[PDB]
Amino acid sequence: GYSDRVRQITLGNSTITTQEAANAVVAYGEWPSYLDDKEANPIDAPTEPDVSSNRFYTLDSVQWKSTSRGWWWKLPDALKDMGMFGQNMYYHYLGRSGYTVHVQCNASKFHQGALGVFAIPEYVMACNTEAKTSYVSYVNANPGEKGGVFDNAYNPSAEASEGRKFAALDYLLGCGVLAGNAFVYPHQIINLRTNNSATLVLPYVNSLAIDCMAKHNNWGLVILPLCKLDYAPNSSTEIPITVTIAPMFTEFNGLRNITVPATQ
Amino acid sequence: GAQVSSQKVGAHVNYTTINYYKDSASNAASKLDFSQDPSKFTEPVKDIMIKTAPALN
């Protein structure tokens, strides 16, 4: 009865089902967990919001078309305005979190296409001016739930002030490495003939036990069309990709007044 | 007369010392001494002060 294709995930008051999964990835073979006393750093009693924040949040959907070059998000950035997770994140100097990432994309037995879904620790991307290096604005680096898109062309700005965004060049993974090697990162593939979802469970990954969530994204989430969407009756058809992410084992330290980041 | 002692740990465990000279002044650095008693400077009071109690009663 039980199948690698059929799965239920419940976190807090939220449940996901899928009937065409392909197993699930646990990044680096490690389930998330709370921070042990023998690895702890800040000494204040932490806030552990549990079910209020450790639950599935569904981002705005994006549209996959035959011309799409791909999508990226950063974490915890993508969830910064998500319910109580966002509130706990911004009321504290420090936070850590694992995640269940569930990417959703159904079609039909007559559609074809394949998405690579990658979770990338420290997903540092190139800037879009050659007058400077490492020259990206906070606002452009942290788009929130809307994320960003890849392009298949690199056109750096004439003036430094106009190029303070990522040069998200698809085949270089936006960072000067070949995209074909992205499989060294925890990943699944949504190949429409086989599956309609990808599930990745991510532990906290950093060189520290806990860090400033508003300064630092621990993971990038990359969705790249490896094989383009095609549908014979209408080559210009679009199918949604929906990203749903639950924080897990969240823990926060250094409570004060709320952080309100710059918006321009 | 070789002395075998613990090294200070690095990124990722013993070492050997032999003294070659007849004067102790010739020796390498004294071994780590973790002794301390801050209270001779931070609390040099005649009558014991219990933190949880009033300092002046």
Binding site: A45 | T52, A55
Partner: peptide
């Protein structure tokens, strides 16, 4: 020998007042 570890503690509502002292003592 290490520097001081921090114990697990919660709150108090008590006649024990370690937050107050008198540095006139020389402590």
């Amino acid at each position: 020998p290490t520097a001081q570890s921090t114990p697990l503690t919660s709150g108090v509502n008590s006649q024990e007042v370690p937050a107050l002292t008198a540095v006139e003592t020389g402590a």
